[PDB]
Symmetry: D2
Subunit: 181 residues, 4 copies
């Protein structure tokens, strides 16, 4: 029976902290594969103009291509409308009927899981892993999550470098598509 990580996030942009965290969780929980799932998002979020879903999807593919055990799923961006994790996990249970699912996202996101739709079903579909920076549900501290997507966007908007914060290839993709500037 396979152990499948599900790395859910808006990924605007994906950055090296996300990749460190997925790598650590896969090793710690002996996961066979980690499926990255970019969230579906409208044009605006928390006072924020979220990059179009295709761009966030492509950046996540670029960032994960070199890892033999990472893949990327369009399940949330192609569902249409708002993402509810119960729908994410239902879709992946259908696609991988014989795998145990481990849902991985930021601990600050999972703090509100009892307010997520259908929280009762969530805990029947997967185990949950919250990754956090230092300072039912398992918590994993990841120093590299000091890197945040918000800081990456701020720097890119200010024409300041995001090399090494963000994977090679993603940096150039951000710049040539002018995602944040």
């Amino acid at each position: 029976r396979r152990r499948l990580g599900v790395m859910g996030g808006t990924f605007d942009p994906i950055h090296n902290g996300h990749l460190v965290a997925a790598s650590e969780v896969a090793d710690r929980f002996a996961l066979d594969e980690v499926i990255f799932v970019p969230t579906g998002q409208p044009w605006q979020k928390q006072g924020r103009k979220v990059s179009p879903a295709e761009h966030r999807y492509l950046m996540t593919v670029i960032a994960t291509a070199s890892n033999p055990r990472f893949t990327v799923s369009r399940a949330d961006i192609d569902r249409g409308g708002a993402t509810y994790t119960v729908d994410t996990l239902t879709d992946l249970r259908t696609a991988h009927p014989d795998a145990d699912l481990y849902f991985i996202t930021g601990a600050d996101a999972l703090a509100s899981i009892l307010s997520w739709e259908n929280w009762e079903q969530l805990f029947t579909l997967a185990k949950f892993i919250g990754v956090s920076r230092p300072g039912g549900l398992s918590l994993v501290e990841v120093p590299a999550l000091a890197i945040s997507s918000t800081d990456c966007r701020i720097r890119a908007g200010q024409a300041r470098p995001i090399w090494y914060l963000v994977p090679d290839g993603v940096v150039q993709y951000v710049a040539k598509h002018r995602l944040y500037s």
Copy 2:
């Protein structure tokens, strides 16, 4: 007026020869950008092409790091067999003020010119055919008649000794394709078992 290269190919897989050729042509013809366009439904050969979404992602992975390369879904998001007149009509629509230079392998360019309407082709773009060492194709022989002035150029690219067919055969034989094919693309091919 921007000068845009339009790099048309099936890219199954994209390899370093394609990338060298686009880079050399962009420099030689002073192109501001090269737009890679993976074929949606390439012409059938006597040969099971990888799903278009995989070839699209491989092309994105391969071109991401180049500030002057981008990838278009124009052919992938058009039903039916892919024809270059339709590729260029869509790109003209998306870039109405740009001068377009369609770049592909010399043999495919010969096929385009024997089937598709020249009045449309040479109104939309100029054409660049790239070829590998030892492949002897004359401009007289690439078409059955005289071509519009400055409508077609031919460029030999040594790195096009690397071919997608050889990459697929090697991958099927569990032989390495490192350095023939970009890092990232090699791993993408392996983990999705595209040629196994």
Copy 3:
């Protein structure tokens, strides 16, 4: 006058936190280039440092792709314990008309200032101490007395949560260091078994 960063460290291994810090400092202080200087013989700690040639090659591998980073052998090619006055005297000799900015971790900068001669240090360069989140080091406390005007700046770099010690421990535990440490450096560490 060029403005040159001098990134001094043992780099065992170099990691993405070092590279972020150099990049951020170069942008913030308008540096034209950052010269990485791996220590030749770092001060002994209660800790067996990798041979200097390995740390030099890892730093070259990590910095190669940045047009504004280079690597110097100044400390590696000097016998005896590495001291920053000697590092900066050699770099001043190699770049006599440049303004030098010595960049290192805040704790190492505290050690430099407690042992090495200030008249020489602040004649040769200005100093930038970089620190990770939650590491509380005041500029009052980094030295035992008032510092020359504009002689020292402190910059917090979130990515310096990544530490070389954690990378070495993980590698020793057969745990992944992908994404903490540049591609290429990870493979170099593994195939030379540096921390196994």
Copy 4:
């Protein structure tokens, strides 16, 4: 008993053709490792100003770092003076006393092996593999060797791109050290 490839060349610059060729030979001959050995060279060669040995060595390290089965040796550049392959192989026999050596270089170089010093000893120390472009000693045809160091230098000197001909990292190293321009 290990099978060790010895990839000898001036590597000015190392390029993707060299790496393809070493990769193919290692697979075809089941080599456990390929040791790249940059040749010792004076300031001038065949009417050519050869890059300093340290630069050619570093470029070869940068180019091979990511391959778990490639390494780089300073044996020729640190010997001092002209490189004779009998000395290269004697040095590596000393360093790897229990390995069978396979010396790999361009077929046009090996064509003159009977004029190399001590050719009698060469064939007692190693098997020889000549890699060639299409168009005792084994020959391996490598399409990617259409890429040549000479063409890379000409393009770099003309401010024309060498991306994709030469590994990432090597390209930027060439440019920022102004090796050929």
